[PDB]
Design an enzyme around this catalytic site. Structure first.
Site, PDB file in Angstrom:
ATOM      1  N   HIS A 137       0.821  -1.246   0.000  1.00 39.58           N
ATOM      2  CA  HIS A 137       0.000   0.000   0.000  1.00 39.58           C
ATOM      3  C   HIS A 137       0.845   1.282   0.000  1.00 39.58           C
ATOM      4  O   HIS A 137       0.308   2.359  -0.235  1.00 39.58           O
ATOM      5  CB  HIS A 137      -1.089   0.028   1.123  1.00 39.58           C
ATOM      6  N   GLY A 155       1.912   5.649  10.649  1.00 35.50           N
ATOM      7  CA  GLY A 155       3.328   5.506  10.349  1.00 35.50           C
ATOM      8  C   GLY A 155       3.929   4.152  10.790  1.00 35.50           C
ATOM      9  O   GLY A 155       5.033   3.810  10.396  1.00 35.50           O
ATOM     10  N   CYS A 203       3.006   1.154   9.968  1.00 32.01           N
ATOM     11  CA  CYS A 203       2.929   0.065   8.955  1.00 32.01           C
ATOM     12  C   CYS A 203       4.343  -0.380   8.565  1.00 32.01           C
ATOM     13  O   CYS A 203       5.222   0.481   8.482  1.00 32.01           O
ATOM     14  CB  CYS A 203       2.083   0.468   7.749  1.00 32.01           C
TER      15      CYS A 203
HETATM   16  C1  LIG Z   1       0.355   2.675   8.242  1.00 31.23           C
HETATM   17 CL1  LIG Z   1       1.981   3.357   8.014  1.00 31.23          CL
HETATM   18  C2  LIG Z   1      -0.755   3.672   8.623  1.00 31.23           C
HETATM   19  O1  LIG Z   1      -0.411   4.876   9.197  1.00 31.23           O
HETATM   20  N1  LIG Z   1      -2.142   3.372   8.379  1.00 31.23           N
HETATM   21  C3  LIG Z   1      -2.520   3.017   7.031  1.00 31.23           C
HETATM   22  C4  LIG Z   1      -2.686   1.711   6.608  1.00 31.23           C
HETATM   23  C5  LIG Z   1      -3.053   1.446   5.304  1.00 31.23           C
HETATM   24  C6  LIG Z   1      -3.226   2.490   4.420  1.00 31.23           C
HETATM   25  C7  LIG Z   1      -3.623   2.248   2.971  1.00 31.23           C
HETATM   26  C8  LIG Z   1      -4.355   1.137   2.618  1.00 31.23           C
HETATM   27  C9  LIG Z   1      -4.727   0.917   1.313  1.00 31.23           C
HETATM   28  C10 LIG Z   1      -4.355   1.818   0.339  1.00 31.23           C
HETATM   29  C11 LIG Z   1      -3.614   2.939   0.686  1.00 31.23           C
HETATM   30  C12 LIG Z   1      -3.250   3.159   2.006  1.00 31.23           C
HETATM   31  C13 LIG Z   1      -3.054   3.788   4.840  1.00 31.23           C
HETATM   32  C14 LIG Z   1      -2.698   4.053   6.142  1.00 31.23           C
HETATM   33  C15 LIG Z   1      -3.127   3.535   9.426  1.00 31.23           C
HETATM   34  C16 LIG Z   1      -4.477   2.933   9.084  1.00 31.23           C
HETATM   35  O2  LIG Z   1      -4.625   1.553   9.020  1.00 31.23           O
HETATM   36  N2  LIG Z   1      -5.634   3.760   8.858  1.00 31.23           N
HETATM   37  C17 LIG Z   1      -6.756   2.901   8.586  1.00 31.23           C
HETATM   38  C18 LIG Z   1      -8.020   3.582   9.082  1.00 31.23           C
HETATM   39  C19 LIG Z   1      -6.837   2.642   7.089  1.00 31.23           C
HETATM   40  C20 LIG Z   1      -7.192   1.396   6.629  1.00 31.23           C
HETATM   41  C21 LIG Z   1      -7.269   1.150   5.277  1.00 31.23           C
HETATM   42  C22 LIG Z   1      -6.985   2.160   4.381  1.00 31.23           C
HETATM   43  C23 LIG Z   1      -6.621   3.413   4.836  1.00 31.23           C
HETATM   44  C24 LIG Z   1      -6.547   3.652   6.197  1.00 31.23           C
HETATM   45  C25 LIG Z   1      -2.753   3.009  10.799  1.00 31.23           C
HETATM   46  C26 LIG Z   1      -3.116   3.742  11.871  1.00 31.23           C
HETATM   47  C27 LIG Z   1      -2.834   3.320  13.114  1.00 31.23           C
HETATM   48  C28 LIG Z   1      -2.179   2.121  13.285  1.00 31.23           C
HETATM   49  N3  LIG Z   1      -1.827   1.389  12.213  1.00 31.23           N
HETATM   50  C29 LIG Z   1      -2.108   1.802  10.969  1.00 31.23           C
END
Ligand SMILES: *[C@H](Cl)C(=O)N(c1ccc(-c2ccccc2)cc1)[C@@H](C(=O)N[C@@H](C)c1ccccc1)c1cccnc1
Ligand SMILES: *[C@@H](Cl)C(=O)N(c1ccc(-c2ccccc2)cc1)[C@@H](C(=O)N[C@@H](C)c1ccccc1)c1cccnc1
Lengths: 304, 304
Positions: free
Chosen positions: A41, A143, A145
């Protein structure tokens, strides 16, 4: 004496954490030999979260779109591929600090240590279980991930988890190091909910054995039970069914305590049907299920 | 989201652990620059546990009576001294993996990470608090002595604890790295009690702020209170009295949540007077006091 949520030492894993940036997105990667593993991602943007076609998105990327940084040193990406939900960035420099490692796909109820990282820098370490519903109840911010989960056998680091995302409940989901997600989750912004989570019965029994070994013997009762009869009471309280394999796995603790498994099971039934009346076992007012029989043996035999 | 007992990464401390043997006794030492620190009881034998005269015992020892082993490397002891309850062995080779470090004497209620070691090899890492009664509720077995407690600020390791012994109630006692015991304990087999341990009120409040930040808000009530009023109720339940300094220290969490400190106090008061009614906060059925406001901020802001 004493019993704590104990993680493995994280030194071997610290030396493998890097920072991976693709365009705007920054996340953690794991650098082993001449390959960096991170969540695929990282190649998305906001327009593409609801339903990314990763194949397509990846094709729009070249080696030079991926900035990998270990400490201050920038590594040169000479290749990139996608294995299921992980990106593999091939770099021109093998990690000098690569430990003996394996990739393992762990089973629900097993535990591991998490090295929570931000910007490729280790922040903290804690012990987690893979829940029966294939989530983990971690502690992770934006951040995080790319942060990894692992177990250490002697010198071998067994990588079993890579953090990919947080769910609506606040629970976390991720993959093994081959990019296969644990559970039915997908790397996209959509409605995803974990199934009903059950309590890991074998883990509670191990924790109860740890309590006895530490002198907390009150809950011990005058009654025994049978697998069938216990399992009936378990289903009612959303406990996982107990198998003879579970009975066999608890043998070391039964032998050290002189308390047979089915007598311990009978004590659990009473704690489940009558509660704890406001007492505490090993400092807790609830039954703990994130300790394996191995975790208990380790924290009571002193393995290094 | 989520909230776990999180330790610092232990890599910096792993590279400093050695094995110290004097006669029959083996325990852990800390190797920094050309000095190895360990508990002075390493020089004692069974006949000498009730009341050892260390000065005398030490006089019967020479440099060559001390075997220091780091991994497979044997280090050469070129000097030895006793500072309070620690032995300092001077060796001919400075530790190449010596981190930036300080020695600090930590206040009661503060937390630190423990790297539990056996035979100079790291086994596990966990987070602890120095209790108001100057004990710690750790997880250590025979051979743990010389394992250390620390905090890491950026690249700087602050050593604050060396494990010396387990008390009758199976809590643990030790020293700072100048060998001065925390609390009134002494390194002999006499009868030693910790006396009354109170709850670290400021830490419970921090944890409650952590809960709110994680969406656990049931316990918030329509009341406020005053310092005096709250403290009268705190003393009743063996909570440490809350000062204005504690109030100042909670300002970040207060500002983050938009919940005033004294309103949070009023919520604690009711929980104390009414219990939790079998509900939980952050997966616990009791009030947790081993996280500081800093621990909370760190876990809810992402420091590395
Ligand atoms: C990881 Cl560095 C992070 O800050 N995320 C995050 C995970 C996944 C994605 C993503 C997924 C698919 C396509 C593009 C981007 C973006 C950000 C946080 C997170 O999981 N937010 C959740 C609500 C989310 C899920 C699915 C898509 C987007 C966002 C996160 C926050 C806190 C702890 N772990 C991860
Ligand atoms: C540490 Cl490697 C250990 O196994 N001990 C221990 C501590 C201190 C001494 C000692 C003290 C004075 C003179 C000689 C030797 C010996 C062993 C364990 C321990 O503290 N046992 C207690 C009961 C003890 C206290 C004081 C004297 C003797 C024994 C120990 C066990 C478990 C966890 N930590 C430490």
């Amino acid at each position: 004496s004493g019993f704590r949520k104990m993680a493995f030492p994280s030194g071997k894993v610290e030396g493998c954490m890097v920072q991976v940036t693709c365009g705007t997105t920054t996340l953690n990667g794991l650098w082993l030999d001449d390959v960096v593993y991170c969540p695929r991602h990282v190649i998305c943007t906001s327009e593409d979260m609801l339903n990314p076609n990763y194949e397509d998105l990846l094709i729009r990327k070249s080696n030079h779109n991926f900035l990998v940084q270990a400490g201050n040193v920038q590594l040169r990406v000479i290749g990139h591929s996608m294995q299921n939900c992980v990106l593999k960035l091939k770099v021109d420099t093998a990690n000098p600090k690569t430990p003996k490692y394996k990739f393992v796909r762990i089973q629900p109820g097993q535990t591991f240590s998490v090295l929570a990282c931000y910007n490729g820098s280790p922040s903290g370490v804690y012990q987690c279980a893979m829940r029966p519903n294939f989530t983990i109840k971690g502690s992770f911010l934006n951040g995080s991930c790319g942060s990894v989960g692992f177990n250490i056998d002697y010198d071998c680091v067994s990588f079993c988890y890579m953090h990919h995302m947080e769910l609506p409940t606040g629970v976390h989901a991720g993959t093994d190091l081959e990019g296969n997600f644990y559970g039915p989750f997908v790397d996209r912004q959509t409605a995803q909910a974990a199934g009903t989570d059950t309590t890991i019965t074998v883990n509670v029994l191990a924790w109860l054995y740890a309590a006895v070994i530490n002198g907390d013997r009150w809950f011990l009762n005058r009654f025994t039970t049978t697998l069938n009869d216990f399992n009936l009471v378990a289903m009612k309280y959303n406990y996982e069914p107990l198998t003879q394999d579970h009975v066999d796995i608890l043998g070391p603790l039964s032998a050290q305590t002189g308390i047979a498994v089915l007598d311990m099971c009978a004590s659990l039934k009473e704690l489940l049907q009558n509660g704890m009346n406001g007492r505490t076992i090993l400092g807790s007012a609830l039954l703990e299920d994130e300790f394996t029989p191995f975790d208990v043996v380790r924290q009571c035999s002193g393995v290094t």
